Amino acid sequence: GNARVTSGDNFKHVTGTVTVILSQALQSNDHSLLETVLNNRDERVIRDTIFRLKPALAVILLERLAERIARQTHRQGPLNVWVKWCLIIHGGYLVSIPNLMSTLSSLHSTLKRRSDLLPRLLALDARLDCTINKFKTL
Amino acid sequence: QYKLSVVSGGKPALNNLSSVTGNKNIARLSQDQRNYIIPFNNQIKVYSVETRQCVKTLKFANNSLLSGIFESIVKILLGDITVAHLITVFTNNGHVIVLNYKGKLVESPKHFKISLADEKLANVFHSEGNYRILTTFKNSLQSYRLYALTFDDAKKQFEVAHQAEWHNVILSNISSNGKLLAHMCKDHKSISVVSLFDDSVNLSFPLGSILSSQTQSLSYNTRYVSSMAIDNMGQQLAVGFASGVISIVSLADLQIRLLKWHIDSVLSLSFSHDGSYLLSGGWEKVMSLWQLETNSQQFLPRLNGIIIDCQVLGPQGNYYSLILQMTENNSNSDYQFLLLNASDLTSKLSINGPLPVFNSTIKHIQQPISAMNTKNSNSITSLNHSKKKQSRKLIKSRRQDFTTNVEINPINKNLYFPHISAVQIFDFYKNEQVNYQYLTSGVNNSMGKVRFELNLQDPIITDLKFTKDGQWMITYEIEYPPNDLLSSKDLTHILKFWTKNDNETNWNLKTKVINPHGISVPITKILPSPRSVNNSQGCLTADNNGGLKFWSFDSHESNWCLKKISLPNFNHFSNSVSLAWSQDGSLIFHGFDDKLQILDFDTFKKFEVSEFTLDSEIQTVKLINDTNLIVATRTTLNAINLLRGQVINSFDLYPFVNGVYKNGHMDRLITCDERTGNIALVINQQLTDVPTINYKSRIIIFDSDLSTKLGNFTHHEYISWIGWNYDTDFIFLDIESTLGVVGTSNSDIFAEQLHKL
Amino acid sequence: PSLSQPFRLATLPKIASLSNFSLQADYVQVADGTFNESTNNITLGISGSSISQYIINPTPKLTFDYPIPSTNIITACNAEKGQANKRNVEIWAFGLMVNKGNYTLNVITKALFLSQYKIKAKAKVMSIKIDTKNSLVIAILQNGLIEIFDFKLTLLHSFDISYDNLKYAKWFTENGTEYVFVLCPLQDDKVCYKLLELTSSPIKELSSTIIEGFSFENSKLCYQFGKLYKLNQGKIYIYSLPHCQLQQVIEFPMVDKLSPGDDLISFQPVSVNRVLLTVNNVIYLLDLLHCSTLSQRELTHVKTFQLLKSAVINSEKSHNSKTIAIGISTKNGPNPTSSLEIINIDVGTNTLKDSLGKSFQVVILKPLFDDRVKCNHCNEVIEKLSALQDNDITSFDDIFFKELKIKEEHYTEKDRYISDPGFLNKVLDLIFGKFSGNDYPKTLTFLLTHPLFPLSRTRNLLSLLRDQPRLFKQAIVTCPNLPLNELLEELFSIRNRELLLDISFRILQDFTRDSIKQEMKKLSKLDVQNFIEFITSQSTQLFQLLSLVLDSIGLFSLEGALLENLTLYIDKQVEIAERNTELWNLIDTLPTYTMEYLDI
Amino acid sequence: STARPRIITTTPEQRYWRQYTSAQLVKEHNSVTHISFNPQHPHDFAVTSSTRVQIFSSRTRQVIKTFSRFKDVVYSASFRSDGKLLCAGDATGLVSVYDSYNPRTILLSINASTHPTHVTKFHTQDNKILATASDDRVTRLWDISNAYEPQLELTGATDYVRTLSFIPAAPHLVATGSYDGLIRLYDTRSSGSTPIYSLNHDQPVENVIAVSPTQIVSCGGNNFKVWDLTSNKKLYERGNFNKAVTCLDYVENFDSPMQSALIASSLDGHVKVFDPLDNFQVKFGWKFSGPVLSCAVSPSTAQGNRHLVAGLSSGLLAIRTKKKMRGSEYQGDQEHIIHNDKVRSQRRMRAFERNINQFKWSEALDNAFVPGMAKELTLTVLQELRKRGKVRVALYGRDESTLEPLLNWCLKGIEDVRSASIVADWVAVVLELYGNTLESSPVLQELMIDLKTKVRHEIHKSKEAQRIEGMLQLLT
RNA sequence: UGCGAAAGCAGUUGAAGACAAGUGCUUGUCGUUCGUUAUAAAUGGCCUCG
């Protein structure tokens, strides 16, 4: 029927920079404006924009990145580098935060969830290389 | 003070003789076709067909003669042979009992005894005042003798006279009229048909003639017969095969006709009274009425179980009587008797007893024969080996749990059985099933599993319980991936929350949690929260790693939410996790491996002694009252007063409970009332000169703090489970599927004549 | 739950009537109306001195005083706030008696003296309840007369309970209506209990019962929420209204030791099923439901402390767990001085947590069944072992096992009867005294495997077994409840590879990450320095321990020079195990024209 | 017998608002300054643009009436409580009252002041009196009977007064907000001309709205604050907007799961819905081409399709609407025993469901890989077949031609975390079942070589992903 | 099959009798027994009432 699905890892109830476009999009919750910012794929830009982004806005930026990856996993990779750089640049600020798991619960579930593929995928790659090794030599 | 008394019934009685096929049914319809009589293992129930309720019950316990005699009923015959609601019961030993339904059972029935010399009575039958009896005498094949029975009024005795004797009878069947018998013998094999009261029909022929040359070329399953049917007139005989092929043979000229739709071994074949129709059923759970005139077939699919036996029951074939197996439960053979109206093929009357699921198989229960040996079935060769292995296991081995989970409804007091992928709701007050609800996804009624499909395992409900208030049901289930796949080892753990307003009988699903506590981690224990915290609207979940989570229904969310959590990521593993909660609602007693912990609910952490070590691993932790806590380890049980933190009483459990039962069965065997005291149940195998099949059970009532034994009482069978009903009384389920309970003028003449007229 | 330090309200005057400390509480009356949870005022009648109203917070201060002659004794006093014909007025009623010849009933009205009136009462006034809503003053007399007066002390109604020599009367409200119950001594230790309803007659008798076995002379009586408590001879007797039936008797052992005559006992209620008990200078917060001592406090600076009244919390309805109690404290010295003191009390949450393990109440194996089935003398052994000569290993062992019939060199399920702790404890003491140095009896191995090894000997056990490796090894594998602190320093001092291995598993097995992690922080940096080096020099659990070490060290403490070496080792391990991953899964893992030669 | 089980394949507050799907954009000559809805059926709404006021039919959603009498800019189109009368303001300061749906005839024409009259509203409680606010900074209260002198002339504003509000249940109370940043409350029962008290907003006040009898929401500058007069202080404040909020409207007791909705314009192209029951928290929003100057919603008693209308400085008007055999009929009303057995047919089942129910394992797999079919629905049917234990069976009679559609999906499904373990399952079986054909078929090899590259890519992101997980643990 | 967690840790899968086929010998089987904790494959898939 209309029953809602959930998982046990749901810790919810327990130049060239676009920094200013990002900050405005995040403050106003403008998904369309945010989506344009996330479209850039140059790692050089990503560090610069996050470098100048205010630490207060950095914590909540991690929240959108978690939600957007969760809705579409195929963007997990490109969106990961933003989470990578946000934690690098604002790591010290994030330490001085009274709770992280509750406010970053979606990220942990998203990152926890994706890792479970690594064991099973390696099982394929061995089976999978075995047949590959067979027909190239043949 | 206390006393034990049997309350509910048991499984339906069946003619469990391997040779006879198609004559499994002993239940019978009245001559007026207004009520149906079903003998059970411990009683006989008469159900009025039109209203679909049990009008009358006859308990063997109530009658002294039946209590002493009950040996199982081999047949029932309407009326009394010696002589309008009389019925005669024939049991295997030979006792003949004339009793009366539609009235008050007479304490002195017309008990009689047939004289048999080393013969086990198998079947009886009549056509018009003439009675013949079939009996068993002893290559692993039982032989059969046909005798004539007559009641002499001078001596008031049943005299038995010999008519015939057939040897090494493999399979046997009787016509619907009850005047012809077809049997198969090894004298590979030969089938012979004989008239019973007359000499008209006497024919025999080797099975090789009927079998096809290809059938000889192919495997033994093609040559292996599973069922047979014989016509009333005798011209046609149907032979089923393990491959699922049916062969109709014309006896006059031994010509064969192949009817093949069943893809697995055909289990039940029955001819119609006229013979124009063949009724067939097997593993497919689908009923096939073959129209022989044009070789068509009508289908009634999605019968609840596999069809064991089939009969057309009526002067005009108005009703069909069917037997369903429910092979999904390997622990016990679950028979359900279904009377369908032929007019619309709708269920006129469905009768079945309580259907508990035990951890391991019991007594001599054997899976039905299939084309291949599977988890739910036995192959041709697997039958004897499985029987021998089962006997040798239950004798030699020490692990004999046979324990079943059961739940009670606080609002309704109605009994819930967690069947495989389903819940049976059974009312023991009335001793009748109220509901059967499938509580999981998977193949439960989508289709009938056959061949390799039968190896699939459906989702298994392991824990089923309610909140105190009773509006909420919490279900923990395990989904098993298929074999021969990469993801064939990642068992899925699912939780569901289910509520139902009292007037309905069907729950509607509100919440479902996938993989609680993470991935591949079982939910070892559950505990619903009490009235104090959240008004019985919360509950707790515990793993084998000691991780604890509290869920609760959030009104704003309109659903359940993980209020609170603790994951001590313990590397070590133990399936024995016991959980107790205080009535006020402050603490948690969490017993993991050998250590008990007192965790404060507000901080959800050890109280700031919280840690209590035990000699061995905890199976149960419970508090009889707020002041005293009872903890059972695998070697003993100990009463601890929290107020002083010193042990009151220590009872040594090792002599009876060492490794017989898996961890966690102590939970469902040990039960406690909230006011008077607790009860301890200990079962032990009885043996005279190596261990014997039968078991013997002691029930001991103990006061709070285990100071004194209120009452020690004895039961003559393995009590699978015991629990505390919300009344004083405790209900116990016994492997006989038996729920017992331990608890404290001219006008007058004219009116009579008018009534007669 | 806790008891705060008393703080002085006032110093009692040096009057002869107050010189008798044992009766001092009888000469000081506390008004019921002004003393409750929410009121900051206390009205107190000190016999022969005055009736005074004090403010408690922020500092104790005297707000009002009405003098009384020194020869007068205050028998009942009450003060409340309300409206009279409308001005807000405070009505004070006090009943004084002079030399038993006459009894005075007085009513005083104050504006927030508007009027002061006085009448002669027929008998001693015991209890005074004033109804501001109806402008009525109700007085209960020792002769059984309940007289209702207006604020002008004009007698409106008089009710006689028919019995004389009243000793106890208390007012209580339930469901918005006012009630009163009285106790009347009778002969042969019998007592009449009467419950009266306040609504032709404003007083209606609901219940009348005679209670047997209820003595007064040595009994302390108090009432709370339909429940009457009687303290007598160290037993608190628990009675419930409206019938005043006995429900429970709770024995308080610590009062049983009190010699009759010297120890001064006061008893008052503080919350639901919770009472205050004083014995001389010690104060007790007791939970009568769970029979536990929630809190205890001793006032070393005073000889005695007597409770007068306590503001009672309805914990079932009130989120507040803090209240106050007022009592009289008497100082030590040749010239004792009595003072009025207030104690702030934290009753708690009224849950069993407050009572867990604080009970004020202070074995042999027995068969399961008293009476054809498959089954799957300490002191004398104690004496024999002690009688041996020093350092006799063979005899000490031979006596232990022959007497107890122990067969195998480790604890087994068949040794349950020996599990009693007391016998084990002294055997350990005998071994320590009997044997010192390098040679210990095999018996130590038996106890060391025993599940119930005493916790008192767990400390320094590893230290005791350092000399002999096998005993040290045996302890780690099976010794119950070995302290983590010692397992760690032994882990952090030992060079043996096998011994380092087994310690880690036992630590990770029996202790959670948080418990271990905090214990890591205290360890020296030079120690943890050495054991990263050892790892750079079953292994998964050891690596897990290192991960527990590294987080404990923190990012500040870790040194780059070591960090490079650890990183290389980690780099080496990942490459191998990824390689092993591939190997593991591998282990889980017609032509149109054909040209051929035929053989003949 | 039992019925066949059917195969199994945001907020309540949001799903109500996404039903305003239909969007039509109209262009006006000048900026649409004010928008008003009729209190009465058919709830036609007025737009103030240029020198005209236009009336749009709710159902038709186009102009039905036009008021072009006004020579200069038009500043208001608020209706009367009965909806019969239309009052408006002009830069000349003249305020004119018109019969709704009768643009020809002027009922009452009043000269409030020489300065512009930017606000003109009928009093909701008392029908006769009409309030006018002008750049003269005096908010004259006029009555229809007396068109020559105001009944009351509230003063004390030191900047332009462009906001007036009448508090429900308080006919005597009048609320005005000036560009001083001060919101002034006046009592008409008293002498007036001096505010009862002033509320400081600290920013120019663009629109003041009385949400409830005691709660008034003032939207000015970049934030809106809700003030309770009983406490006289702001209960809540929200500043999520980027530009200065301009217009704000409130609707109550409408059929949505939410009882009451608060819409506020931003001047950033944003109009957002706030729920009063949860301290005015953001529940939904829209984005438009340019700054929003006006916003309104259909009244609670719309009695038909609900309308959302927003006003832009460009003159663009955006409307979003939530649309709202002679015995065959006997029915046995007089009849003795009524009986019914008619059973509705099962919902139309898809092709893949039919194949599995009919045990067409291979075809169901074929149905799985078809053009223009949902990725989720693809995972379900494959998930069923795995649950059916029909994995090798569905893959037995296949060749490279009919195997590629499965593998192409696997090439894409391996990226998704949901289908990774499922794509994992199928791939191994076909390799184990079609190793020989793989050797002799090149296309399957090149089809394969890309799969190895992608799964390798999936290895890497896992490898980083756990690196990100581990460092996050150090952070906390 | 035993234990255990779910990962896994150890340990098994023997002998006799009978039948069939091929040529006393060989292989395969068992609605035969004793003892040990101990691929499939007879063209053969689920009713109707809108």
What is the residue-wise DSSP string for C338-363? EEEEEEEEE---SSGGGGTT-BS---
CB B325, CB B309: distance < 8 Å: no
Residues whose CB falls within 8 Å of the CB of residue D191, separated by 6 or more in sequence, listed in order: none
Judge contact between B123 and B131, C-beta under 8 A. Answer: no
Q: Which nucleotides of E are covered by protein (CB under 7 A)?
A: 2-7, 29-34, 36-38, 40-50
Report the alpha-carbon distance of residue C184 to residue C192 in Å, rounded.
Answer: 5
Contact at 8 Å (CB) between D218 and D232? no
Could you tell me the two tokens for C221? Answer: 């009586």
DSSP D17: H
Q: What angle do CA C488, C491, C495 make, to 5 degrees?
A: 160
Rounded to whole angstroms, the Cα distance separating C71 from C124 reads 15
Give D287's contacts in chain A (Cβ within 8 Å): 30, 32
D388 CB within 8 Å of a chain B CB:
yes
CA distances from C143 to B221, C187, C201 (A): 107, 16, 19
What DSSP state is assigned to residue B452? G
Cα-to-chain-centroid distance, residue B560:
35
> Cβ of B716 < 7 Å from strand E?
no
H-only helix segments in C418-559 = 421-434, 443-448, 461-464, 469-478, 484-491, 497-510, 513-522, 525-536, 539-557
Q: What are phi and psi of C436, to 5 degrees?
A: -140, 150
D50 contacts: CB under 8 Å, gap ≥ 6: D28, D29, D30, D73, D74, D315
- Judged by a CB distance cut-off of 8 A, whether residue B627 touches chain C is yes
What angle (nearest 5°) sits at the alpha carbon of residue C481, between those of residues C478 and C483?
115
Question: Cα separation of D122 and B263, whole Å?
Answer: 84
Interface of B with C in 714-743 (CB under 8 A): none
Distance from C-alpha of C151 to C-alpha of B681, rounded to nearest angstrom = 71
From the number of C-beta atoms within 10 Å of its C-beta (0-12, 13-18, 19+), residue C183 rates as buried
Any A CB within 8 A of B567 CB? no
Q: Taking the CA of residue D210 as centre, how many other CA atoms within 13 Å lie in the half-sphere pointing to its CB?
A: 20
Q: Mutual orientation of helices D361-368 and D375-387 as an angle, nearest 10°?
A: 160
Q: Is the CB of B387 under 7 A from strand E?
A: no
Q: C581: which chain A residues are within 8 Å (Cβ-Cβ)?
A: 122, 126
Angle between helices A19-28 and A43-52 (to 10 degrees): 60
Exposed/middle/buried for residue B28 (C-beta within 10 Å: 0-12, 13-18, 19+): middle
Which nucleotide has its C1' atom closest to residue B220's CA?
A: E29
Q: Is the CB of B567 under 7 A from strand E?
A: no
CB contact under 8 A, A14 and B518: no
Backbone angles phi and psi of C444, in degrees to 5: -60, -35
Nearest residue (CA) to C1' of E31: B170
CB-nearest partner of B564 from A8, A10, A14: A14
> Which of D468, D471, D473, D474 is most worth mutating to test chain A (most A CB atoms within 10 A of its CB)?
D468
d(CA A118, CA D461): 9
Disruptive mutation site among B299, B449, B480, B486 for chain D (greatest number of D CBs within 10 Å) = B486
Cα–Cα distance for residue pair B308/B22, rounded to 1 Å:
8
The residue length of chain B stands at: 757
Q: How far is C484 from chain D (nearest CA, A)?
A: 24
Candidates A10, A13, A102: best to mutate against B (most CBs of B within 10 A) is A13
- Sign of the CA dihedral with B544 first, then B547, B552, and B557 last: negative
Strand order in the sheet with D223-228: D205-209, D215-220, D223-228, D233-238
CA separation (Å) from B675 to B114, B722, B725, D10? Answer: 54, 17, 12, 48
Answer for the pair B271, B176: CB distance below 8 angstroms, yes or no: yes
**Residue with nearest Cα to nucleotide E29 C1':** B220
Cα within 13 Å of Cα(D28), Cβ side:
27
Tokens of C436: 């010192």
The span from the CA of B610 to the CA of C174, in Å, is 41
**Positions 497-536 in B, CB within 7 angstroms of strand E:** 520-522
Please count the CA atoms within 13 angstroms of the CA of C455 that sit on its side-chain side.
8
Contact of B24 with B123, CB cutoff 8 Å: no
> What is the distance, to the nearest Å, from the Cα of residue B755 to the centroid of all Cα atoms in its chain?
45
Identify which of C585, C592, C1, C598 has the alpha carbon closest to the alpha carbon of residue C284.
C1
Gyration radius of chain D over CA positions: 33
The two structure tokens encoding residue C202: 């404003």
Say if residues B368 and B325 touch (Cβ distance below 8 Å): yes
Q: What is the dihedral of CA C465, C468, C471, C472, to 10 degrees?
A: 60
Q: What is the DSSP string of C538-555?
A: -HHHHHHHHHHHHHHHHH
Cis peptide leading into residue C242 (ω within 30°): yes
Element (H, E) at D175: strand D173-178
Distance CA D380, CA B206 (A): 53
- Length of chain D, in residues: 476
Strands B296-300, B287-291: pairing is: antiparallel
Q: Which of B513, B554, B564 lies at the smallest CB-CB distance from A8?
A: B513
Rounded distance between C-alpha atoms, residue B739 and residue A57, angstroms: 65
Q: How many CB pairs under 8 A join A and C?
A: 20
Q: Which nucleotide is nearest to B168 (CA to C1')?
A: E31
Say whether residue D2 is in contact with chain B using an 8 A CB cutoff: yes
Residue in C290, C375, C544 closest to B643 by CB: C290
Residues of C in contact with A129 (CB under 8 A): 582
CB C46 within 8 A of CB C69: no
**Phi and psi at residue D80, to the nearest 5°:** -80, 165
Residues 331-350 in B having a C-beta less than 7 A from any atom of strand E are 345
Question: Under 8 Å CB-to-CB from D93, ≥6 apart: which residues?
Answer: D111, D112, D113, D114, D115, D116, D117, D134
- Asked if the C-beta of D277 comes within 8 angstroms of chain B's C-beta atoms, the answer is no
DSSP state of B130: -
Alpha carbon C16 to its chain's center: 39
Q: Are D97 and D131 in contact (CB under 8 A)?
A: no
Cβ–Cβ gap C586/A130 under 8 Å = yes
Q: Which residue has the tokens 């054991």?
A: C531
Angle at D361 between CA D358 and CA D365, to 5 degrees: 125
Q: Would an 8 Å CB–CB cutoff place B303 in contact with chain D?
A: yes
Contact (CB, 8 A) for D293 and D270: no
Nearest-Å Rg of the Cα atoms of chain B is: 29
- Whether any strand E atom is under 7 angstroms from the Cβ of D354: the reply reads no
Rounded Cα distance between C491 and C504, Å, is 8
Distance B368 CA to E31 C1' (A): 13
Whether C147 and C157 have beta carbons less than 8 Å apart is answered as: yes
CB B498 within 8 A of CB B479: no
In one-letter notation, the amino acid at residue C335 is N
Report the alpha-carbon distance of residue B255 to residue B267 in Å, rounded. Answer: 23
Strand partners, D142: D130
Angle at alpha carbon of residue B285, lines to B282 and B290, rounded to 5°: 60
Q: How far is CA D136 from the centre of its chain?
A: 37
Please say whether the beta carbons of A57 and A23 come within 8 A.
Answer: yes
Q: Answer yes or no: do C586 and A122 touch at CB < 8 A.
A: no
Cα distance between residue B643 and residue D428, in whole Å: 61
Dihedral pair phi/psi, residue B418, rounded to 5°:
-80, 85
Omega of the bond leading into C367 within 30 degrees of 0 (cis): no
CB B463 within 8 A of CB B526: yes
Which residue on chain B is closest to D1 by alpha carbon? B302
**Reduced to 3 DSSP states, what percent helix, strand and coil does chain B have, rounded to the nearest 5?**
5, 45, 50
Find tokens 């590629």 and name the residue: D404
Distance of CA C327 to the CA centre of its chain: 22
Distance between start and end Cα atoms, chain D: 58
CA distances from B353 to C61, C84, D321 (A): 81, 77, 60
Residue entry with tokens 């819409």 = D263
Euclidean distance between CA atoms B51 and B47, whole angstroms? 8
How far is it, in rounded angstroms, from Cα D377 to Cα D9?
6
For chain B residues 281-310, those near strand E by a CB cutoff of 7 A are 284, 286, 298-302
Strand B628-633: give its sheet, edge to edge: B618-622, B628-633, B636-641, B646-652
Q: At residue C188, what is the residue type?
A: D
Q: Which of D77, D100, D23 is nearest to D316 (CA)?
A: D23
The strand pairing partners of C160, in sequence order, are C145
Burial class, B64, CB count within 10 angstroms (exposed 0-12 / middle 13-18 / buried 19+): exposed
Rounded distance in angstroms from the CA atom of residue B210 to the C1' atom of nucleotide E27: 28
A6 touches chain B (CB under 8 A): yes
Q: Which of D424, C172, A89 is nearest to B486 (CA)?
A: D424
Elucidation technique: cryo-EM
Six token digits for residue B54? 């049990």
- Could you write out the DSSP letters of every residue in D90-131? BTT-EEEEEETT--S-EEEEEE--SS---EEEE-SS-SSEEE
The angle, 0 to 180 degrees and rounded to 10, between the axes of the packed helices C497-510 and C484-491 is 150
Cα distance between residue B513 and residue B552, in whole Å:
13
CA-to-CA distance for D75 and D134, rounded, in angstroms? Answer: 11
β-strand pairing of A4-7 with B508-514: parallel
Q: Give the rounded distance of the alpha carbon of B287 from its chain centre.
A: 22
What is the rounded distance in angstroms from the CA atom of residue B288 to the CA atom of residue D107? 87
Find out whether B434 and B505 touch, Cβ atoms under 8 Å.
Answer: yes
Tokens 């809503």 belong to residue: C133
Question: Which one-letter DSSP state was computed for residue B450?
Answer: -
Question: How many contacts does A have with B, using Cβ atoms within 8 A?
Answer: 50
Cα–Cα distance for residue pair D277/C502, rounded to 1 Å? 61
Q: What is the rounded distance in angstroms from the CA atom of residue D8 to the CA atom of residue B446?
A: 13
Measure the CA angle with vertex B536, ends B535 and B542; round to 5°: 135
Helix-strand-coil split of chain A, %, nearest 5: 70, 5, 25
Gaps in chain C (C to N over 2.5 angstroms) fall after 85, 112, 199, 362, 371, 376, 537, 589
Whether residue C423 contacts residue C381, with contact meaning beta carbons closer than 8 Å, is answered with yes
Measured at the CA of B404, the angle between CA B399 and CA B407, to 5 degrees, comes to 155
Longest pairwise C-alpha distance within chain B: 93
Q: How far apart are CA B574 and CA C204, in angstroms?
A: 67
Specify the 3-state DSSP secondary structure of B66. Answer: helix
DSSP-assigned beta bridge partners for residue C8: C341
CA distance D362 to chain C (A): 27
Residue whose token pair is 């005993």: C471
Residues sharing a CB contact under 8 Å with residue D438, sequence separation 6 or more, in sequence order: A131, A135, D431, D444, D445, D448
Name the neighbours of C, counting chains with at least 3 Cβ pairs within 8 A: A, B, D
DSSP assignment, residue C586? Answer: H
What 3-state class would DSSP assign to C307? Answer: strand
**Helix orientation angle between D400-413 and D361-368, rounded to the nearest 10 degrees:** 50
Q: Print burial letters for C468-506: b (CB count within 10 Å at least 16), e (below 16).
A: eeebbbbbbebbbebbbebbbbbbbeeeeeeebebbbbb
**Residue D281 neighbours by CB distance under 10 Å:** 13
CA distances from C11 to B601, C14, C337, C340 (A): 46, 9, 8, 6
Beta strands C227-232; C220-224: pairing state: antiparallel
Residues 647-676, chain B, CB closer than 7 Å to nucleic strand E: 659, 662-663
The verdict on a CB contact (< 8 Å) between A8 and B511 is no
State how far residue A110 is from chain D, nearest Cα, in angstroms.
9
* Token code pair at residue D118: 């930017």
CB B388 under 7 Å to nucleic chain E:
yes
Residue with nearest Cα to nucleotide E30 C1': B381
The DSSP output letter for B20 is: B
* CA-based nearest residue to C156, from C109, C96, C90, C203: C203
DSSP letter (8 states) at residue D449: H
For chain D, give percent helix, strand, coil, nearest 5. 25, 30, 45
8 A C-beta contact, residue B228 and residue B240: yes
- Give Cα separations from D384 to D356, D371, D397, D412 (angstroms): 9, 20, 19, 20
Which nucleotide lies nearest residue D390, CA to C1'? E45
Rounded Cα distance between B246 and B256, Å, is 10
DSSP-derived secondary structure letter, C418: G
Token pair recorded at residue C62: 């005297």
